Each structure stands twice: as structure tokens, then as C-alpha cells.
Amino acid sequence: MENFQKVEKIGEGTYGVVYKARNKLTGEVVALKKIRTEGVPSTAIREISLLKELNHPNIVKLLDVIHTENKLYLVFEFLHQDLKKFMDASALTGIPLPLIKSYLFQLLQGLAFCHSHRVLHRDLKPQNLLINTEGAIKLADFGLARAFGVPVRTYTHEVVTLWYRAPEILLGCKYYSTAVDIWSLGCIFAEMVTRRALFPGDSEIDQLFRIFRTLGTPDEVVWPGVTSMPDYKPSFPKWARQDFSKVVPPLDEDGRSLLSQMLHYDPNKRISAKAALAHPFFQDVTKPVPHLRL
Numbered sequence: 302m303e304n305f306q307k308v309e310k311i312g313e314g315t316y317g318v319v320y321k322a323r324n325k326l327t328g329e330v331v332a333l334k335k336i337r338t339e340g341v342p343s344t345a346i347r348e349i350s351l352l353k354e355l356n357h358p359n360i361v362k363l364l365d366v367i368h369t370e371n372k373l374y375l376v377f378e379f380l381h382q383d384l385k386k387f388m389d390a391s392a393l394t395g396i397p398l399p400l401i402k403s404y405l406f407q408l409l410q411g412l413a414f415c416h417s418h419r420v421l422h423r424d425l426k427p428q429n430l431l432i433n434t435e436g437a438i439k440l441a442d443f444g445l446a447r448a449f450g451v452p453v454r455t456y457t458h459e460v461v462t463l464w465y466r467a468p469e470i471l472l473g474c475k476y477y478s479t480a481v482d483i484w485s486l487g488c489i490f491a492e493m494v495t496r497r498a499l500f501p502g503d504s505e506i507d508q509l510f511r512i513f514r515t516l517g518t519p520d521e522v523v524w525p526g527v528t529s530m531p532d533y534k535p536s537f538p539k540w541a542r543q544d545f546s547k548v549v550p551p552l553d554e555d556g557r558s559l560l561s562q563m564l565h566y567d568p569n570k571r572i573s574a575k576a577a578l579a580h581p582f583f584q585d586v587t588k589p590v591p592h593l594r595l
């Protein structure tokens with residue numbers, strides 16, 4: 302608390318507020334996430350702490366986990382900018398295609414690693430993705446769903462952002478699979494390409510219907526078991542799937558085919574991170590460096 306000095310606020314997420322903070326002693330600059338409460342569920346501390354042992358080049362390092370005074374703090378290594386800011390900064394020009402492809406490849410590498418270790422993110426979004434000057438991108442802030450779970454808002458007086466949420470989550474499924482992170486990454490991939498969010502829903506039903514309007518209202522043919530899910534209603538309007546050409550123009554067909562496999566309704570048909578890494582879209586992948594304004 303007094304062992305840092307706040308530099309800036311970085312942002313506000315689903316599970317808390319994030320600050321750029323300088324360690325008073327070592328000079329170290331870190332990203333510090335603050336979550337405010339009866340006091341804490343203590344079960345999480347063991348499993349959140351377990352994430353300190355996630356070690357991989359595409360995952361933002363979790364340095365410490367500290368529970369004190371009705372607060373839970375997560376200390377992360379500091380990266381140079383998040384993807385949301387970079388995308389906004391790139392809005393007029395666009396992120397160069399080879400850089401998009403490098404970022405997607407790297408994000409899949411980090412996911413394939415987490416997933417092989419049975420660790421799901423469940424909240425992916427551009428604010429959760431961090432980049433540096435040498436061209437790396439990293440995923441941050443896993444767990445925190447399997448650990449806490451969420452109400453109408455994030456923590457205090459912020460709504461949940463629905464834009465990246467898998468349909469099976471929106472339909473009320475109690476058991477999530479790693480497939481939910483693939484859906485989120487697919488939505489983010491589309492957004493990097495077109496420079497607009499793919500499914501910008503303002504409510505849970507608006508989110509669902511925006512998905513349906515594009516991809517077609519799911520049924521038992523394309524998604525066995527869909528009509529028996531907790532929040533499914535037979536009264537959903539029936540939209541026909543649109544031609545996929547309008548979704549990520551003008552990405553090439555390898556890109557479109559990969560996105561289409563990331564956006565399958567049935568979590569069982571949805572491509573894995575490991576299989577995605579082998580898709581022909583990545584045959585030519587390189588590692589360019591971004592132009593960042595810090």
C-alpha cells in the first residue's frame with residue numbers, strides 16, 4: 302500500500318481496477334490489480350496463487366498475490382501497452398496484416414499452453430492482452446472466474462462486457478470448456494482485422510441476437526443439445542446464416558476459414574488452440590515489430 306507509489310490508473314476490468322505502480326524500494330515498475338465485501342473467499346487464494354506458477358513467454362507473469370485489509374492485490378510484470386489502446390491508436394491506418402497474424406499465433410501458443418495445463422481464462426478481451434516494443438503479445442489475468450464468479454456488474458458499479466462472451470455462456474451452461482477462450486480470441490481477431498467490434502451487444506439478449514443475426518439461429522442440427530440449455534427459449538427468432546463474406550473483409554480465405562472454425566456454435570466442433578496453430582493461415586507467419594506511442 303505505502304510500499305508503492307501510484308503512477309497512473311491503467312484501467313478498470315471485470316474483477317477490479319488496475320494501476321501502474323512503482324515499488325518504493327527496488328524501483329521496479331509493476332501492474333497492480335486491486336479488488337475490493339465480507340472479507341474474502343479464502344479458497345481462491347490457494348488457486349490464484351497457483352497461477353504464480355504459470356510460466357510461458359505469451360503469458361503476463363503474476364509476481365505476487367496479497368490478501369490484506371478486505372482487499373486482494375495481484376502484482377503483474379509491467380508491459381508497455383494493451384491491445385485496446387493499440388487498436389484505437391491504429392484505427393485510421395489499421396494493424397498491418399503480418400502483425401495481426403503474429404499476435405494471433407502467439408495468443409494461440411499461450412492458450413494451448415494454459416489449456417494443456419487445464420487453466421481457462423474465461424474473460425478474454427483486448428484490455429487483457431498486452432504487447433511490448435519487440436513484438437510480443439501476452440495474455441493476462443486468468444482464473445478470477447473459476448475462482449470468484451460474477452453478478453450484474455464487475456465488482457462495484459461497472460457492467461459486464463458481453464462482446465467476447467461464448468454463446469454457451471450466454472445460454473446459461475453451468476460447465477464451461479476451453480472452447481470459450483477460442484470464441485473470445487476469434488471475436489478479437491475479427492476486431493483487429495475490421496477495426497470494429499464483431500458482436501457489440503448492449504444486453505445479454507442483444508449479444509445473443511447479434512450473434513444469431515450473423516451466424517444463423519442455432520438449432521439441434523448444428524448444435525446438438527442447444528434447445529435444452531438453461532436459457533434457451535423456443536421463442537428466439539429464427540435468422541438464416543448470412544454469407545460469411547461480410548464478416549472479416551477483406552481477409553483471405555485461409556483467415557476466413559480459421560475464423561469460421563473459431564466461431565462454431567458447438568464447443569465440440571470449435572477448433573482447439575493446438576489445432577489452430579497448425580492451420581495453413583500460419584504457414585507464412587513472421588514476427589514484425591509494432592510502432593507504439595508510449
Ligand SMILES: O=C(O)c1ccc(Nc2nccc(Nc3ccccc3)n2)cc1
Nearest residue numbers: 319332334378379380381382383386442
Ligand atoms: O497505456 C496504457 O493504457 C497501458 C500501459 C501499460 C500497460 N501495462 C500492463 N502490464 C501488465 C498488465 C496490464 N493490465 C492488466 C490487465 C488485466 C489484469 C491485470 C493487469 N497492463 C497497460 C496499459
